[PDB]
Amino acid sequence: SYDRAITVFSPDGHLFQVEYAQEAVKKGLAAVGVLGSDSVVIAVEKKSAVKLQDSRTIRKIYKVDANIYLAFAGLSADARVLINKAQLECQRFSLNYEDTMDVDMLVRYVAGVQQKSTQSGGSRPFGVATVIGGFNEDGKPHLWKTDPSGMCSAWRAVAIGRHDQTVIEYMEKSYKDGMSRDECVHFAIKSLLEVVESGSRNIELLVLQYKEARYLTEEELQKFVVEVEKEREEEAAAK
Amino acid sequence: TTTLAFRFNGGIIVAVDSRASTGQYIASQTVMKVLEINDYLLGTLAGGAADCQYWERVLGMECRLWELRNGSRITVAAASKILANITYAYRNHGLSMGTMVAGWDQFGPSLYYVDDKGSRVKQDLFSVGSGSIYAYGVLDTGYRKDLSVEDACDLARRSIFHATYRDGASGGIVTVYHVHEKGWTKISRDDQTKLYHRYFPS
Amino acid sequence: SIMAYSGGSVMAMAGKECFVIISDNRLGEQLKTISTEVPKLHVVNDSIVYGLTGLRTDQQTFANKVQFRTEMYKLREERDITGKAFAAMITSMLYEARFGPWFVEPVIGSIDKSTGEVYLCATDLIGAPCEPEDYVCAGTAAESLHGMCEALWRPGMSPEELFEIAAQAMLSACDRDSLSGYGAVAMIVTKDKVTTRLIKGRKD
Amino acid sequence: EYDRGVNTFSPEGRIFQIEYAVEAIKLGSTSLGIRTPEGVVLAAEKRVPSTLVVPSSMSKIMEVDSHIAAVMSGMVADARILVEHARVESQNHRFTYNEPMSVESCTLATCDLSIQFGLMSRPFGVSLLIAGVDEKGPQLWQTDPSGTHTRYDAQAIGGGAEAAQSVFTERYHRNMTLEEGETLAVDILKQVMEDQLSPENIEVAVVRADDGKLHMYTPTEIKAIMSRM
Amino acid sequence: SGHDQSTDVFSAEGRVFQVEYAGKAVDNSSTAVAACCKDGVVVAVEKVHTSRMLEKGSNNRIHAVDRQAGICICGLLPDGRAIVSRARQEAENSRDIFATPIRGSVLANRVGEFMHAYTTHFAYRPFGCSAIIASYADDGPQLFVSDPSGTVAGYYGVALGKAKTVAKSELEKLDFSSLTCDEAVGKLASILHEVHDKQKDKLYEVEVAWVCDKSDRKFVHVPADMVP
Amino acid sequence: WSPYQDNGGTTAAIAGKDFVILAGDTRLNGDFCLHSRHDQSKIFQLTPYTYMASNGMQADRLQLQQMLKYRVKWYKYNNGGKVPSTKAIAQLMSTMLYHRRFFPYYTFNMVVGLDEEGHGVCYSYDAVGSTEPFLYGTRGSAASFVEPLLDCLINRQHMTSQAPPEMTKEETLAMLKNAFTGAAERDIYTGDSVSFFIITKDGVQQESFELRKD
Amino acid sequence: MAETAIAFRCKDYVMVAAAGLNAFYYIKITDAEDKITQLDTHQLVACTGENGPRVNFTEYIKCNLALNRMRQHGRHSSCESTANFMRNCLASAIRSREGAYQVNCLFAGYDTPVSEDDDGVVGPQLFYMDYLGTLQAVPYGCHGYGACFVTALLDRLWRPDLSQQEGLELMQKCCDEVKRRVIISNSYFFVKAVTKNGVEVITAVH
Amino acid sequence: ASGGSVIAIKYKGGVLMAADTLLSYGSLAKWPNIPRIRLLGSHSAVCATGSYADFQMMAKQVEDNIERQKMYHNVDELSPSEVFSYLHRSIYQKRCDFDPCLCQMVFIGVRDGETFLAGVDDVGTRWEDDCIATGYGAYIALPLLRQALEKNPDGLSRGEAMRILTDCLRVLFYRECRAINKFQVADAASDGVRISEPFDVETHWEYEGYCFEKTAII
Amino acid sequence: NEYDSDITTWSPTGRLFQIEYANEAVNNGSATVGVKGKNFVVLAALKRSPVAELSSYQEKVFEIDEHVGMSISGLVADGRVLARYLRTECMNYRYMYSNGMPMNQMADMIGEKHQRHIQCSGKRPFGVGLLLAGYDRQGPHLYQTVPSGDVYDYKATAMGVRSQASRTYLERHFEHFSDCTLDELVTHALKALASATSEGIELNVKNTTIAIVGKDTPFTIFEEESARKYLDGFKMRP
Numbered sequence A: 001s002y003d004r005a006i007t008v009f010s011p012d013g014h015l016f017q018v019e020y021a022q023e024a025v026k027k028g029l030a031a032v033g034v035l036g037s038d039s040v041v042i043a044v045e046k047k048s049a050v051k052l053q054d055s056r057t058i059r060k061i062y063k064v065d066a067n068i069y070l071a072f073a074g075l076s077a078d079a080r081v082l083i084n085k086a087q088l089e090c091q092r093f094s095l096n097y098e099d100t101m102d103v104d105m106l107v108r109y110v111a112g113v114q115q116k117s118t119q120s121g122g123s124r125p126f127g128v129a130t131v132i133g134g135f136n137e138d139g140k141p142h143l144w145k146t147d148p149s150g151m152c153s154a155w156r157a158v159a160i161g162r163h164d165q166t167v168i169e170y171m172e173k174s175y176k177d178g179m180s181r182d183e184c185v186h187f188a189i190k191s192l193l194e195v196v197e198s199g200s201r202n203i204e205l206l207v208l209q210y211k212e213a214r215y216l217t218e219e220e221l222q223k224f225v226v227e228v229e230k231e232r233e234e235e236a237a238a239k
Numbered sequence B: 001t002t003t004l005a006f007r008f009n010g011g012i013i014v015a016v017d018s019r020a021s022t023g024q025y026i027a028s029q030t031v032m033k034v035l036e037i038n039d040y041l042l043g044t045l046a047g048g049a050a051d052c053q054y055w056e057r058v059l060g061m062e063c064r065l066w067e068l069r070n071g072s073r074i075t076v077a078a079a080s081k082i083l084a085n086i087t088y089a090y091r092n093h094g095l096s097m098g099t100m101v102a103g104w105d106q107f108g109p110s111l112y113y114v115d116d117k118g119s120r121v122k123q124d125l126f127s128v129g130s131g132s133i134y135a136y137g138v139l140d141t142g143y144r145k146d147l148s149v150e151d152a153c154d155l156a157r158r159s160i161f162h163a164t165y166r167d168g169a170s171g172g173i174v175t176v177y178h179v180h181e182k183g184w185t186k187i188s189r190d191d192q193t194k195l196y197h198r199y200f201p202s
Numbered sequence C: 001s002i003m004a005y006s007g008g009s010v011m012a013m014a015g016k017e018c019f020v021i022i023s024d025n026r027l028g029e030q031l032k033t034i035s036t037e038v039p040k041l042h043v044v045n046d047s048i049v050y051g052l053t054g055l056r057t058d059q060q061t062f063a064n065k066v067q068f069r070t071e072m073y074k075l076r077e078e079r080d081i082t083g084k085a086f087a088a089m090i091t092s093m094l095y096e097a098r099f100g101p102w103f104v105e106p107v108i109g110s111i112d113k114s115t116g117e118v119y120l121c122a123t124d125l126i127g128a129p130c131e132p133e134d135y136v137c138a139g140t141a142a143e144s145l146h147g148m149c150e151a152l153w154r155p156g157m158s159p160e161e162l163f164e165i166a167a168q169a170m171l172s173a174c175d176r177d178s179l180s181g182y183g184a185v186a187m188i189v190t191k192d193k194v195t196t197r198l199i200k201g202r203k204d
Numbered sequence D: 001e002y003d004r005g006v007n008t009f010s011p012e013g014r015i016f017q018i019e020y021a022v023e024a025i026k027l028g029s030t031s032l033g034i035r036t037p038e039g040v041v042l043a044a045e046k047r048v049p050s051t052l053v054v055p056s057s058m059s060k061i062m063e064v065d066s067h068i069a070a071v072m073s074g075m076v077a078d079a080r081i082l083v084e085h086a087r088v089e090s091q092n093h094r095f096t097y098n099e100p101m102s103v104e105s106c107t108l109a110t111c112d113l114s115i116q117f118g119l120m121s122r123p124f125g126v127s128l129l130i131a132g133v134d135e136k137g138p139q140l141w142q143t144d145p146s147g148t149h150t151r152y153d154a155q156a157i158g159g160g161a162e163a164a165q166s167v168f169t170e171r172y173h174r175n176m177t178l179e180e181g182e183t184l185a186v187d188i189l190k191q192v193m194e195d196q197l198s199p200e201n202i203e204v205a206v207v208r209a210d211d212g213k214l215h216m217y218t219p220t221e222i223k224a225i226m227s228r229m
Numbered sequence E: 001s002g003h004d005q006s007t008d009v010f011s012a013e014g015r016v017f018q019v020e021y022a023g024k025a026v027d028n029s030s031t032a033v034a035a036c037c038k039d040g041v042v043v044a045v046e047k048v049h050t051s052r053m054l055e056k057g058s059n060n061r062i063h064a065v066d067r068q069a070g071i072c073i074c075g076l077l078p079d080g081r082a083i084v085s086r087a088r089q090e091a092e093n094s095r096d097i098f099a100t101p102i103r104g105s106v107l108a109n110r111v112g113e114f115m116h117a118y119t120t121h122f123a124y125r126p127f128g129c130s131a132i133i134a135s136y137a138d139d140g141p142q143l144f145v146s147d148p149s150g151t152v153a154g155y156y157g158v159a160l161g162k163a164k165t166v167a168k169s170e171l172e173k174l175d176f177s178s179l180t181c182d183e184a185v186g187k188l189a190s191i192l193h194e195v196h197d198k199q200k201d202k203l204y205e206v207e208v209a210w211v212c213d214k215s216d217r218k219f220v221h222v223p224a225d226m227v228p
Numbered sequence F: 001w002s003p004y005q006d007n008g009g010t011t012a013a014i015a016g017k018d019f020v021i022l023a024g025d026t027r028l029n030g031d032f033c034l035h036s037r038h039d040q041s042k043i044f045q046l047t048p049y050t051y052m053a054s055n056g057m058q059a060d061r062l063q064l065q066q067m068l069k070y071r072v073k074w075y076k077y078n079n080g081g082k083v084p085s086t087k088a089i090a091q092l093m094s095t096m097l098y099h100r101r102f103f104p105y106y107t108f109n110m111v112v113g114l115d116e117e118g119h120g121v122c123y124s125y126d127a128v129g130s131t132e133p134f135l136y137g138t139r140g141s142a143a144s145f146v147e148p149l150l151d152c153l154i155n156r157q158h159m160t161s162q163a164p165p166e167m168t169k170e171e172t173l174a175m176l177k178n179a180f181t182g183a184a185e186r187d188i189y190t191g192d193s194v195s196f197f198i199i200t201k202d203g204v205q206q207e208s209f210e211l212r213k214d
Numbered sequence G: 001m002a003e004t005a006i007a008f009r010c011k012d013y014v015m016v017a018a019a020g021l022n023a024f025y026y027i028k029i030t031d032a033e034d035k036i037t038q039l040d041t042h043q044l045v046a047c048t049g050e051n052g053p054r055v056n057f058t059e060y061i062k063c064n065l066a067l068n069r070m071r072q073h074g075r076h077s078s079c080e081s082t083a084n085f086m087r088n089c090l091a092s093a094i095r096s097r098e099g100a101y102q103v104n105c106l107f108a109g110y111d112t113p114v115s116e117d118d119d120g121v122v123g124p125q126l127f128y129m130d131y132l133g134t135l136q137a138v139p140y141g142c143h144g145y146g147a148c149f150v151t152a153l154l155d156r157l158w159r160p161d162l163s164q165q166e167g168l169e170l171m172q173k174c175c176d177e178v179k180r181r182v183i184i185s186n187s188y189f190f191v192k193a194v195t196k197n198g199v200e201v202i203t204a205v206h
Numbered sequence H: 001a002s003g004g005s006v007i008a009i010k011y012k013g014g015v016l017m018a019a020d021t022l023l024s025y026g027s028l029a030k031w032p033n034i035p036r037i038r039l040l041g042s043h044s045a046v047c048a049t050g051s052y053a054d055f056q057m058m059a060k061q062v063e064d065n066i067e068r069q070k071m072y073h074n075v076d077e078l079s080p081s082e083v084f085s086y087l088h089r090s091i092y093q094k095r096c097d098f099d100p101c102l103c104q105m106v107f108i109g110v111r112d113g114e115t116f117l118a119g120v121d122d123v124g125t126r127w128e129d130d131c132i133a134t135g136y137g138a139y140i141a142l143p144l145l146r147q148a149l150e151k152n153p154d155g156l157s158r159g160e161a162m163r164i165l166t167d168c169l170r171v172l173f174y175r176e177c178r179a180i181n182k183f184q185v186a187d188a189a190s191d192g193v194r195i196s197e198p199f200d201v202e203t204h205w206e207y208e209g210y211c212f213e214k215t216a217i218i
Numbered sequence I: 001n002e003y004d005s006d007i008t009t010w011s012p013t014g015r016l017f018q019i020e021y022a023n024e025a026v027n028n029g030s031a032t033v034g035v036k037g038k039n040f041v042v043l044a045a046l047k048r049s050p051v052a053e054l055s056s057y058q059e060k061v062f063e064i065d066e067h068v069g070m071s072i073s074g075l076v077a078d079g080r081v082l083a084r085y086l087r088t089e090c091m092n093y094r095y096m097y098s099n100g101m102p103m104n105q106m107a108d109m110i111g112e113k114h115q116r117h118i119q120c121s122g123k124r125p126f127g128v129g130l131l132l133a134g135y136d137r138q139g140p141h142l143y144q145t146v147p148s149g150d151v152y153d154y155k156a157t158a159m160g161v162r163s164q165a166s167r168t169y170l171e172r173h174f175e176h177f178s179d180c181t182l183d184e185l186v187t188h189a190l191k192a193l194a195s196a197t198s199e200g201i202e203l204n205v206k207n208t209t210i211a212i213v214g215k216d217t218p219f220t221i222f223e224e225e226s227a228r229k230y231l232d233g234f235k236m237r238p
């Protein structure tokens, strides 16, 4: 088979093919993760309500296993392949060890797969950053980010995709450790609103609690977005 | 071989004899038949001493690699599965190995029997080996959940003793362990002829 | 015998511009009867009906494999497969497994929609086609069916006549077989129409 | 570019991809080792991208076995592959020889994976300091992207490796106490690392000669080191 | 620029520049000389020693392929040794499979086919040596030269290397119908001593081998007494 | 045609506090005849401190010996000159025997040597590597004679008498000379000579000793 | 064969019983091992063989079903679909190096409408499956030594229209008839039922 | 096609090996003119009891290995010990492949003083000794050869070693069924191995107890 | 230069540049020296000299079998790859023949193995030089292997940085090495090696390995206590 070296070091020590996979992720739609006391919230931006896209609800936050959900940023196609890989690995893990696989275990697996793509001859990297939330069987909440290099870190709150660094610099100013299900959701939307269009319709967000994954209805959501956009008017008046 | 484990309110007792016998000739009277997989997990070896020793040592390696990778001790469920997956892979390679994985994980004490055919049974009480048929008679009659640790070791030790007295393939030293939240402790190591003169003084 | 395990017999029969294919309804494991409502006939298209005898697993696996091949054909070729091609295809599939065969003995009835000429093909488990003018049969009651079908069958029979002698054959042959019965489903294929009939038989 | 193949020498006799994987390490976070007779100290700037990162998660020091710890510098994702291999080899050694793998043998096994690139497109952009305790005593080894392994008494890899070698030349002697080694390890990281040194900002580990066991220092325990300096 | 980077590519003129360039490696190499007589065949090669401190028999350019056959390598010695190793593999297939000493003409064509293989494919480069195959199997005394291209030719006499031109002038003075292997050892060595640059390559010896009636049709180095 | 042949002979070891005496008879018997009286293949040095004794089939003993010699050589290279402990070689022997459990070496091995603390030790094996450290051991045709005698004279478990002091190197050697003399008399496949190896911290001191030649 | 599994299907539930017995030669390891594995919310399989194959098979089905839900954005597959998936898995195995899975299944399920557009089977489904991969829809069916006893008893007493209560009574008669007549001690039966509402564990009957 | 017995004995300054010149095909004595002893390079000879075909293949494999190594690399020829080591490993590899070399070789050699004599079985059993035999040589000849070595413990002369070989061949002729009275003796001394022109041994058949009248059943 | 990128590209002047470049790896490696006498071969290698009170160790000398060992210069990774190969091949040989691989045969094996790497596109030349030193029936052998696949049977030689100074010293004395004792050989090996040292640094146990092989002496590497017998009482005088 074709095993030419695609990901290779350049004079300055850079892996250009991984830097470019990260350029693909910066272009990708913003996703956001917020860890609370008893909740993980993952909020993603959608490309925006085109009249033609099927009214039937498609979720941009993918379910890897009962416990584990992931948003991604970058190439939709590549991400689908990682998620199908993750989905298989969680089930390969339940087969080989009765236990459900912990979030941190899966994240390392997904990050390993992303690393292999930066060192496999014949393949470009996955052009995908990932935000993986969930609860271990014990009850502890986990929020992780995986970048195309295959390096993964756990966060208290995180952003991927367009203006990730603007959202993270914004988040670390305002983020508080112990947060209620409602405060997390509030914070996640407030954080996404830093970069996403003023619109409420683009944001779609999932609230993980131990054994309870629920997506906010666009009715439930527009209450929070009104409450947040009136608070972003309060912060515009202050400055 | 005789080898029994049981769950009770104080945790898990594991008790074993010490004899390796090729049916007729006693190879050894000093075989350690409880492998100490990690600090919180015990295997028992019955059947093919090689097969059990080898595959419990592999299990111990997978359990340690698990602890390095995931930075948390493996569960008994997962450890018993790892071994049940091996014995199932080798199910028609004529392995001879009846095993019990007993431990204390996040989810309290767990005891599993694991066969050479990939069986993996989770119950509160087992005995395994040629002398099980003997151990079970004593063990089932004296077994309650509410036993003290003292009385649970007594029951176990007597149950192994009664197998060593009657099974030709079973004998030597009656070793007893206790698995509790803090790990396992080797309770006692008593020769089964000394136990005869303890239990039947006349 | 692995072939006699599941039980069931199938028979097909050529008339004038028509054929009758008829299976019993029993599914067994040796002598224990699991179901009395398991006909062994499969409809490829208007013009072709086949039965599978033999080990029920392989009837079901082989029937699936055939349903894959006949649906793929229909898409690629943009036409219904013909009896001859269908039978050739089936010998190819059975002989693909010469060393490790499917325990099935297919009975294929077909009719050319234009010409009205009937094609029967029984096959052994490794694909050897048997393509007679009169009738074919397979399964546990096959020795007893050959006797009935030899006796009752004439050349140029109308569909209705043909049905009667095929039903009487299948039932009489199944009454002398432990492993086949609980009546029969027959299928009378003509150019014009396809009749299907559940036939009252013993409960034995 | 792709004009030069991966397996190509330069006119001065260096394989290019290796010479460029080494330039990738000088970008990476500073790590260092101090072999003392009392034990061996690994320390590591964490270089957390944000305050929001759970600093425990992006661990620069990794347990290879009870008695061997690796600290990485350069591409972290790559190091995880190398340390995964060290762990498998360490445990295969225990399995096969019923004894802890020697630190050198564990370094050699980690460097066995680093030669096989053409299977792997490129070298690992990681340098590893592997510190442990075996019969030979406490030992500190460095792996390179080349597959070379070099025993050191003290070594720093990553960003301020060059500035830290200068401090070792001046300060390191062979009869250090583990306590002085820890003090030195952190004294260097303070001078070298870009951010202001905190108990959470750096990772410290020691394998002590006496028990032969690895201890990862908690932030509490690293504050105790900063307190005596 | 791209016409000559690999041996898988013909130029517009219809030639394979990488094979021409491999040939340049032989023409810049130490001079080898050989003679096919009635008695047998003789190979003499000049070995240019880089250092005064080499052992006698270091960088032997002449290797027994079989009892009856030997390859002298003019060119890159290491490349040459890959051919010798193959020539051997062929010589031992002839004995293993067909129970016969490989014929010279066969061995030569087998060496040429091998060297040619490496001129056809982008992944490989042509060999940097001309093999001189001397044999005395059942087809009589045979001298062949496989060049980097894989082109085999039989010779009465043959010079390769940087003194190819001048060494050939001296081989043309010999009568090949008349001369014996015992004369040739003398004249071939004498030729190599004559054509050698004394100021450029100070340290050198003349490795001679033969396979003749004298040596029992066995391919051996000639003793040191005959060599001058 | 069986790939297996039992070439007879007995090995025995006895550990003391500072040494092991390892012994193995020298007769190599074939099918109904005897091939050699001077076969030394039974005992094989792996390291200065560690020896393997090996019974059953000679050809497999000879392979296994070389397979271990090369695993031990690799260990020296990978572990910077350091020779593996007796304990390491004992686990290696368990592991190597088990890796062949689907066409096993017909070879009843002991690994014998000094441990970490200088104390002698004998690992006896089955066909497929089950072992334990013990202070004596016997494998081979006369193992069933010698093992009960060693149990009796070392462990003394059915004796009311006070246990004799310790058993020196010369007493331990004498006990084995006696045990082999008995085995040679009664086992038809043990005989000719016994090679004794007396492994100590200092070095291996080896002496032959004659048995019934018949 | 030692471990008898019984199932029957009525208007608005499938009832499944399976013997608790796990055995080693002649030694009851336990009288209370649950052979009835829930595959989905409305799907379960009384699987009877040795523990090794029974678990490795059922877990493989359960994990592939769960994987197929993860990839199909939480779409619950029909019972025909998983019955066929299971039989293809059993049938594949009888021509594999591994050998057959020596497990006999009664695969019970309740098909609910999975959307507004679902035109498919509503209600309870029961599938007899041999170890070989023989799949057959049945109103009731049994594996084990007790199979033929209970199959006859059900032929006699089973109606398609029994209450959940008349079903408990009937399942008790079936279990009782295995205990009365089979020499292998099947002293405890796990009984489960699949309704519109999902799997419920029946404790009354054992 | 099967070789019969081979017998070999060390003497002062070499090794004699002897073998009938007969390949049998079961009971049938097919070929009585087969040179069963083969020279291996300059120092060593080998002879096999059992499949001639397996011997022919092994002897070929070995003799190539020896000549190749010597001719390719300017190294000293393999010693007897080393050639025998190669033969042993080769035969054992074949029994590990369940494709055995179904013959018992006897192997002699002499490099300098160093005098090598050894046997190797189908299964890779190997043994050096002062006398080796394979086939019925092991059961018949060995006892006698061993007795001749026990009686002359200093070592046999060539004459004494030849006298005892000849007496063993005589008995093999009487008692091995698949034998002929035509032998060859390899003699490995310093110079190298010579193989004798084939010879017969005088045979006594005229004991008074072998007469028709005594041996009669009735 | 459009011809220096791939191993498979001949220049128009008939040079293989990727081989000439792999040779530069050897010439920038740390100096090792080999001298052979009647019965012995002595490898002497410069290690890296401790900076202040701070030591480095890097395995540059390798035992390969009882009767052979190596001193490498250049890419130490590639030295390890050859070390493993030669060890594996020497074991195989000794397994088969119960005797050490003859040195002429081993020299041919490394040559061959180097050559496999100088012709295929996928592979690259070894960036390491070896000094094989061995003892067999034919006596002591000292080979210098080189990336090009050439193998030089040497009376004495040096390899690595400033080794032209070592080879100059050896050229004055090498004719007298067959007459020398083991202790005179080692003096010569060290005196040669010490010509290769930079500016003012002297040989001593902490910055010099010595390895010996010969008649009845298996290949031994002397470091620290063992080397001091030759190196404590060694000074270099003009």
Ligand SMILES: O=C(Nc1ccc(F)c(-c2ccn3c(N4CCOCC4)cnc3n2)c1)N1CCCC1
Pocket (backbone or CB within 6 Å): B001, B002, B021, B022, B023, B046, B047, B048, B096, B097, B098, B099, B113, B115, B116, B126, B127, B128, B129, B130, B131, B132, B169, G024, G027, G029
């Ligand atoms: O006993 C087992 N289980 C189990 C599973 C696999 C086994 F290989 C063996 C077994 C096998 C040979 N055993 C011996 N042998 C007998 C024959 O005489 C020599 C010595 C001695 N002990 C033995 N135990 C036991 N169980 C009893 C009920 C629960 C499971």
